[PDB]
Amino acid sequence: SISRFGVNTENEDHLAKELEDLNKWGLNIFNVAGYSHNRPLTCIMYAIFQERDLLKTFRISSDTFITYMMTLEDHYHSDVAYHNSLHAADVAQSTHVLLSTPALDAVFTDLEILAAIFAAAIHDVDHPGVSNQFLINTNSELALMYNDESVLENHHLAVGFKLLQEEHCDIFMNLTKKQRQTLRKMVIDMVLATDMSKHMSLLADLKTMVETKKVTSSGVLLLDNYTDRIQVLRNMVHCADLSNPTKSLELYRQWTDRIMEEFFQQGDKERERGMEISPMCDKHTASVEKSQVGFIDYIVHPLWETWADLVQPDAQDILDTLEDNRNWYQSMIPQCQGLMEKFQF
Ligand SMILES: CCc1c(C)nc(-c2ccc(Cl)s2)nc1Nc1ccc(CC(=O)O)cc1
Ligand SMILES: [Mg+2]
Ligand code: NA
Ligand SMILES: [Zn+2]
């Protein structure tokens, strides 16, 4: 069971049936959690690494891998409504699918692939369930440590890398020095690019890149160098981090409930401290359906449209689902600055 899934489970057969969808956008990670004793991140990372032969390629012990992943998953907070191990697992599995998009076939090195999925796994570790801006506004120790810049993203990185230095946790021991160095650099790059306040400038740079794209006669992207590759990978991970609205409505709605609960819990903190309640964080004046439509139309669609343009035609299904979900939320609205502000500056 451990050998098969990297986790103990009372229903191996149900877990195995769900993991049949490992390479699919339609994987249901909530079910994976339910059949893995709420170890979705360890489970999904083990599955992904076996699928891609990454433990063989990089000589990573499977036991050491399970040990690291368990401590990493333990460092996600169960009582944080959205930014917990289920979201990390989702981003990792979503990154895993995006890496296999036909337009990117054989484009990336194995180390690049390793770096993207590892980054996905660690990108929100030890999230406190309050935003960067909250941490800045409350004079937090983390904001003081990190000089107000990508405060949590720097913290997620430091925690993720520090766990590797625990006894029996160094999954990269068998990499060469040069490999370790390159991997570190790439992971730092990608996790720092998940700072939502970089969304606009990241999208601008991606469009610029997409203007210059060239493909083979088979539709495969031609990337000139490292610089172009890591740019696609940053953006890939960002897209995986804003993929909830591109999943089935059933899944999207569960994600939305969770991020609203998280925001509302921060707004209750802010209220208790006599602070102005941040946009999206006031449960008494929230308009959830309307905000999702604006989120999609101004942030998530523009990003996915640029991504879809890059990997044309691979991502049309994703765009169609996103539109369809937008239509649903729009139909459920009962009879702009706060939005856009979390995604720029
Ligand atoms: C993908 C889940 C998701 C959904 C479904 N909706 C929204 C927002 C809707 C309206 C809005 Cl303003 S944010 N944000 C989401 N994620 C998210 C996560 C973190 C942050 C950083 C921050 O707190 O500033 C911003 C957005
Ligand atoms: Mg984050
Ligand atoms: Na935990
Ligand atoms: Zn995230």
UniProtKB/Swiss-Prot annotation:
Binding of Zn(2+) 2 occurs at D124
Residue positions annotated to bind Mg(2+) are D124
Positions with a binding annotation for Zn(2+) 1: H87, H123, D124, D241
Which residues make up the binding site for Mn(2+)?
D124
Superkingdom, taxonomy of origin = Eukaryota
Domain PDEase, first and last residues per copy = 7-335
Q: What does this protein do?
A: Hydrolyzes the second messenger cAMP, which is a key regulator of many important physiological processes. May be involved in mediating central nervous system effects of therapeutic agents ranging from antidepressants to antiasthmatic and anti-inflammatory agents.
What's this protein's family per the entry? Answer: Belongs to the cyclic nucleotide phosphodiesterase family. PDE4 subfamily.
Q: What is this protein called?
A: 3',5'-cyclic-AMP phosphodiesterase 4B
Species for this entry: Homo sapiens
The protein's gene is named: PDE4B
